[PDB]
Amino acid sequence: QIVVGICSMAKKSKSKPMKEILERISLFKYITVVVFEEEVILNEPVENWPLCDCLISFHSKGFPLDKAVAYAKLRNPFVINDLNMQYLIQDRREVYSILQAEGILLPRYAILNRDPNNPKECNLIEGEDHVEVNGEVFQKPFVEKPVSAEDHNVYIYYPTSAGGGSQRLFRKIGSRSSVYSPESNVRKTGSYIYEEFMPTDGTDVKVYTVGPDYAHAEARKSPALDGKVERDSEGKEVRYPVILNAREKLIAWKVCLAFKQTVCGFDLLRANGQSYVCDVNGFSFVKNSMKYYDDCAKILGNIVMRELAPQFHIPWS
Ligand SMILES: O=C(N[C@@H]1[C@@H](OP(=O)(O)O)[C@H](OP(=O)(O)O)[C@H](OP(=O)(O)O)[C@H](OP(=O)(O)O)[C@H]1OP(=O)(O)O)C(F)(F)P(=O)(O)O
Ligand SMILES: Nc1ncnc2c1ncn2[C@@H]1O[C@H](COP(=O)(O)OP(=O)(O)NP(=O)(O)O)[C@@H](O)[C@H]1O
Ligand SMILES: [Mg+2]
Ligand SMILES: [Mg+2]
Ligand SMILES: [Mg+2]
Ligand SMILES: [Mg+2]
């Protein structure tokens, strides 16, 4: 049997989408799935981790990426989602630099780095209705993102013409994704990316790749609006249908290969007749789509078979 190893925190490994997809991958005649126990990932040295021929491994809060990297170096499996790139995906400055190198449209932005060892002072000038970051002017409205991609405390600053103040986004807490603050002054501690506000129809497009030639998209209400989460009868966030255009399918192809993440979530802003990438999240499954479960398991199983069938001497056409 070809062994597919799943290496992630239990919250991910035991998620509904993961269980649905692993059950379908196991339907492949020559594939066996081994899900690495969280206790083993955290507390056992990598030399005691299970063997696999193909490794599906991804960082989330609490995951020891250093260990996953050492395991891949030790055992040299076929890696679906590159582990070294998952360090860069944690840093919005590294994400944006990769997108730029790939000729991918993204909001105009500037980085404000505050050295806490070298705070003689910042390169930031603030007016009522704009900031200047290393000389570059952002008129309100503009967006302020922590450089840490794991920190979801993204602020939007409104112009005087629209009543001033700010919208403070955060990781969903039940009914809410953002709240208005009367505060008009930017944050004075930390490092941030400042970017131009892209005007959408009030929705974000979420894109989910399975290799560079498959991308499911769906839309949700922007947290940049009032911050009230729309939930269905079953208490799941309301999703709106999306079909990607030819330009957007090319963006998905580029993001998947540039970040070396077979399974990759990213966000698109449909604005000014174009589509801008504002976030790359790495490993992410579509939630509550049976057809996605079917398609994702079939593509990942076929990738494994195409890559490893020859050295296993298994017929594959
Ligand atoms: O907010 C939710 N789930 C989110 C995950 O949070 P966890 O439940 O895993 O903590 C989050 O994971 P982290 O970034 O917090 O680790 C990530 O799920 P992912 O691991 O599949 O990426 C994210 O999706 P993205 O933001 O798209 O990465 C999910 O949000 P939903 O897409 O709303 O389910 C929710 F509470 F489950 P819902 O019931 O509101 O969907
Ligand atoms: N330049 C922008 N213009 C307009 N809206 C933006 C912009 N950047 C971000 N947003 C909005 O703010 C939301 C959060 O920004 P995003 O960079 O996706 O944050 P995050 O903290 O990485 N979220 P997540 O998708 O869960 O990882 C987006 O979904 C948009 O609705
Ligand atoms: Mg099987
Ligand atoms: Mg994540
Ligand atoms: Mg996002
Ligand atoms: Mg993100």
Numbering used by the authors: 43 to 359
Please give sentences taken from the publication describing this entry.
Diphosphoinositol phosphates (PP-InsPs) are an evolutionarily ancient group of signalling molecules that are essential to cellular and organismal homeostasis. Among the PP-InsPs, 5-diphospho-myo-inositol pentakisphosphate (5-PP-InsP5, also known as “5-InsP7”) is both the most abundant and the most intensively studied member of this signalling family. Metabolically-stable PP-InsP analogues can also be informative for structural analysis of enzyme/substrate crystal complexes.
While crystallography previously showed that 5-PA-InsP5 binds to two sites in PPIP5K2 (the catalytic site and a surface-mounted ligand capture site), electron density for 1 was seen only in the catalytic site. Additionally, one of the fluorine atoms in the CF2 group stretches its position to that of the other non-bridging O-atom of an α-phosphate, which is expected to bring the negative charge distribution in this region closer to that of 5-PP-InsP5 than occurs with the PA analogue. The terminal phosphonate group in bound 1 is held in an extended conformation although its orientation is different to that of the corresponding β-phosphate group in 5-PP-InsP5 bound to PPIP5K2. Note also that the 5-diphosphate in 5-PP-InsP5 participates in complexing a hydrated Mg2+ ion, a property that is mimicked in the complex of 5-PCP-InsP5 with PPIP5K2.7 This Mg2+ ion is not present in the complex with 1. Compound 1 inhibited 1,5-[PP]2-InsP4 metabolism by PPIP5K2 with an IC50 of 375 nM. In addition, the rigidity of the amide unit in 1 means that the PCF2Am unit contains fewer rotatable bonds than the equivalent PP, PA or PCP structures.
